[PDB]
Ligand binder design. Structure first.
Ligand SMILES: CC1=C(/C=C/C(C)=C/C=C/C(C)=C/CO)C(C)(C)CCC1
Length: 134
């Protein structure tokens, strides 16, 4: 396990448009979303974690307990509900989102002062990197 606490800004984004296409997100929103460089505020307190993907255009908030399955309301992305579980896999943070879509989930880890995040859905993989600014 590692410590994700902090405020992070996006450095890079790769294959995000195809990842959103796999979720049936409309073209217009896909183009707009891929041009946004959202911040990430993570509050880690024990096994309780809050991850806020921030943008004035639109936000997405996660508030969960590691190891405990919860009903994830993805309103704002594709408006789906998934039975999600986020667990530790060594120093990596694994998330599996069970629902209508195949292979939906993500993996997060740290390299120096950078947050690495890979998102997957329907066999598609998106890669993002963030820099710890606070
Ligand atoms: C579609 C869409 C967006 C998607 C956000 C996503 C897919 C966030 C995933 C966050 C995760 C996995 C956080 C855990 O570290 C954002 C809000 C950028 C802008 C508006 C359009």
């Amino acid at each position: 396990p590692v410590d994700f606490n902090g405020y992070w800004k996006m450095l890079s984004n790769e294959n995000f448009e195809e990842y959103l296409r796999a979720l049936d997100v409309n073209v217009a929103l896909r183009k707009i979303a891929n041009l946004l460089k959202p911040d990430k505020e993570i509050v880690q307190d024990g096994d309780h974690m809050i991850i806020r993907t921030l943008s004035t255009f639109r936000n997405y908030i996660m508030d969960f307990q590691v190891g405990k399955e919860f009903e994830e309301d993805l309103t704002g992305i594709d408006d789906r509900k998934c039975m999600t579980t986020v667990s530790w896999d060594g120093d990596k943070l694994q998330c599996v989102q069970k629902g209508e879509k195949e292979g939906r989930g993500w993996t997060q880890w740290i390299e120096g002062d950078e947050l690495h995040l890979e998102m997957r859905a329907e066999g598609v993989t998106c890669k993002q990197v963030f820099k710890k600014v606070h």
